[PDB]
Amino acid sequence: ANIDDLLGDLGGTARAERAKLVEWLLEQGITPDEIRATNPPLLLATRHLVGDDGTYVSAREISENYGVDLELLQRVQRAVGLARVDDPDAVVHMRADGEAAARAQRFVELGLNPDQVVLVVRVLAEGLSHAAEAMRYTALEAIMRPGATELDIAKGSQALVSQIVPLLGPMIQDMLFMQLRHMME
Amino acid sequence: IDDLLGDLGGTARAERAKLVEWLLEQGITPDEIRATNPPLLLATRHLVGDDGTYVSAREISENYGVDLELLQRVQRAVGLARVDDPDAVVHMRADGEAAARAQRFVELGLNPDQVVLVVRVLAEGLSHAAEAMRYTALEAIMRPGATELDIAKGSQALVSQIVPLLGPMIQDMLFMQLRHM
Ligand SMILES: CCCCCCCC/C=C/CCCCCCCC(=O)O
Ligand SMILES: CCCCCCCC/C=C\CCCCCCCC(=O)O
């Protein structure tokens, strides 16, 4: 009788399909608060495969956890452009997003200009946002079968994306270094 | 090393002589120095995976057991070699290994047309990022009155310290975008 709050006003076949999906999501460790916050909730367990762990942090918490400067960390979060509360105490950043932003500081410690490092973050994130869009369409084309229910799609994504994830990191690293070789050549 | 100094005179010749001397003792060959103009970044290129080895697409396909036709589609999408001959030895070795990664995504059921388009868009975005990175690195390395040798040594030192950070950073940035797509 809990899932009723999570089904809201849905009626008919849509309601029954959502109920099956929600049951499965809760089984994958997805929380009711996550489900309520994501419309539609179909791919939430797939979002966990790419580093969402259901936990959120503030910029201050990130700065104290990794021992990095709060003001530089906030410049980097702005350049990425995915967060939208700039309060250093707002608990709004996915944990893994904070860890990524915390990597900028070491580049500055090694003597790179912070203004230039922040511009590089902006440019990298803009390029990758376009690549991730194309990846989305590519993944959905494989997963979205004719007549598939919401639960069908969620389970199909779980199986396929789990196999893709270990290939992605090494691939993008290799693609970066290919570019670095050719700007030197 | 006169053959390696060519037409240079004056201060330019003097600076180049010092650079060539340092390069030769880092293990760079006269052949390689001769082939690269300016030779300033020869002792930094290995740090990003350019060891001077080249391969053909047919060789990559045989050595990694991947489809030659798909591999060439991927090489076109990255668009870095003036080449379309499967037997031309014109691909940097590491670039060929990178292109061989596409096969598994297709084996998993992703549409090869879409996989090729993803490669095209990723390479385009990374080419811009790589330009920005070049500028950032040069700002750090170039001092006033810096000689060729000073720049080569400063580049080697800084690139050696930065390369270990780059891979993990770019992987993290990709997954950050995937979480929000
Ligand atoms: C040679 C380069 C090959 C490029 C490979 C193309 C990548 C294929 C697409 C990757 C799918 C990853 C999608 C992750 C889905 C996340 C959805 C979510 O956050 O809920
Ligand atoms: C997202 C966190 C911010 C990190 C930004 C990374 C900045 C890296 C910039 C410099 C490293 C590039 C290494 C190769 C540069 C070429 C060296 C040369 O000029 O010969």
Side-chain angles (χ1 to χ4, degrees), chain A residues 1-184, chain B residues 1-31 33-181:
Chain A
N2 162 38
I3 76 165
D4 271 23
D5 182 72
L6 304 165
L7 302 173
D9 300 311
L10 287 175
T13 290
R15 192 186 182 82
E17 281 202 25
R18 181 58 54 83
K20 289 191 291 209
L21 175 68
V22 166
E23 176 183 7
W24 184 89
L25 288 175
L26 291 172
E27 293 174 352
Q28 307 324 303
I30 306 303
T31 69
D33 286 344
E34 283 175 286
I35 293 165
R36 273 193 290 270
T38 312
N39 291 289
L42 192 46
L43 298 180
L44 277 165
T46 286
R47 202 174 70 189
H48 282 227
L49 292 171
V50 294
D52 185 7
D53 64 8
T55 81
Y56 293 80
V57 296
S58 73
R60 198 177 306 279
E61 288 172 344
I62 296 160
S63 108
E64 296 290 325
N65 198 238
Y66 296 98
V68 302
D69 181 71
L70 178 55
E71 303 322 330
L72 177 64
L73 171 75
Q74 296 195 100
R75 296 194 61 190
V76 173
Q77 293 181 138
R78 289 177 196 114
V80 173
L82 293 169
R84 207 203 46 111
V85 184
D86 214 339
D87 188 346
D89 292 299
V91 182
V92 291
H93 301 107
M94 286 182 171
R95 187 211 63 70
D97 293 352
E99 183 167 315
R103 294 184 177 276
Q105 175 133 334
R106 185 61 171 175
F107 290 92
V108 173
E109 295 179 13
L110 288 176
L112 303 182
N113 186 302
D115 295 339
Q116 294 298 134
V117 166
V118 168
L119 290 163
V120 172
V121 176
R122 188 183 150 196
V123 169
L124 276 167
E126 290 173 344
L128 293 167
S129 68
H130 310 329
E133 176 265 271
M135 289 175 185
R136 149 156 288 261
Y137 179 99
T138 304
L140 294 167
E141 182 199 11
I143 297 151
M144 295 308 189
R145 306 288 85 192
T149 66
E150 285 169 10
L151 177 61
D152 286 347
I153 294 160
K155 289 182 309 83
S157 185
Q158 192 79 7
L160 175 61
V161 175
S162 64
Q163 296 298 153
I164 293 172
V165 161
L167 307 173
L168 286 171
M171 179 269 296
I172 193 79
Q173 177 166 319
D174 266 14
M175 293 211 63
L176 175 61
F177 281 95
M178 179 145 40
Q179 296 298 326
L180 293 178
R181 288 188 288 271
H182 286 279
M183 86 195 202
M184 283 195 204
Chain B
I1 73 170
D2 271 5
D3 206 303
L4 302 170
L5 300 175
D7 293 324
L8 296 165
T11 63
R13 191 184 188 84
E15 292 199 16
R16 181 59 61 79
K18 296 212 187 201
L19 172 64
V20 168
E21 173 177 32
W22 181 80
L23 291 174
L24 291 170
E25 73 171 289
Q26 298 287 124
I28 303 291
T29 60
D31 323 32
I33 293 171
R34 189 171 296 116
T36 307
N37 259 297
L40 213 38
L41 301 178
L42 278 168
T44 296
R45 74 183 193 178
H46 89 272
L47 295 165
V48 296
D50 177 4
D51 60 351
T53 311
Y54 285 82
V55 299
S56 70
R58 195 177 306 281
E59 290 166 356
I60 295 150
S61 96
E62 299 173 335
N63 290 336
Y64 292 91
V66 301
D67 181 63
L68 176 60
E69 290 189 297
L70 177 60
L71 179 68
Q72 290 192 290
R73 293 192 66 192
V74 173
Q75 294 177 318
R76 290 176 194 120
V78 182
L80 290 175
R82 165 160 45 67
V83 54
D84 227 344
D85 176 340
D87 294 299
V89 184
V90 299
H91 307 281
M92 291 191 184
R93 189 190 68 75
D95 291 356
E97 292 188 80
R101 294 181 178 280
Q103 175 92 8
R104 178 64 184 147
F105 290 97
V106 174
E107 292 181 350
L108 283 167
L110 305 184
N111 185 328
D113 292 344
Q114 291 295 316
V115 168
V116 175
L117 186 54
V118 175
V119 170
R120 199 202 291 167
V121 178
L122 270 172
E124 288 169 342
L126 294 170
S127 76
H128 285 103
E131 296 183 39
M133 288 177 180
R134 186 165 100 266
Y135 183 90
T136 299
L138 293 166
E139 188 270 354
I141 294 154
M142 301 296 179
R143 300 284 162 251
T147 64
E148 281 178 354
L149 181 54
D150 290 345
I151 293 161
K153 286 176 162 176
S155 304
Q156 194 187 245
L158 182 63
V159 173
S160 57
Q161 289 188 293
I162 299 286
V163 162
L165 307 179
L166 289 172
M169 176 277 291
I170 189 109
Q171 295 195 33
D172 266 21
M173 292 194 66
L174 174 61
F175 279 91
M176 176 152 57
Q177 292 298 325
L178 294 174
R179 288 185 291 273
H180 296 271
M181 54 165 21

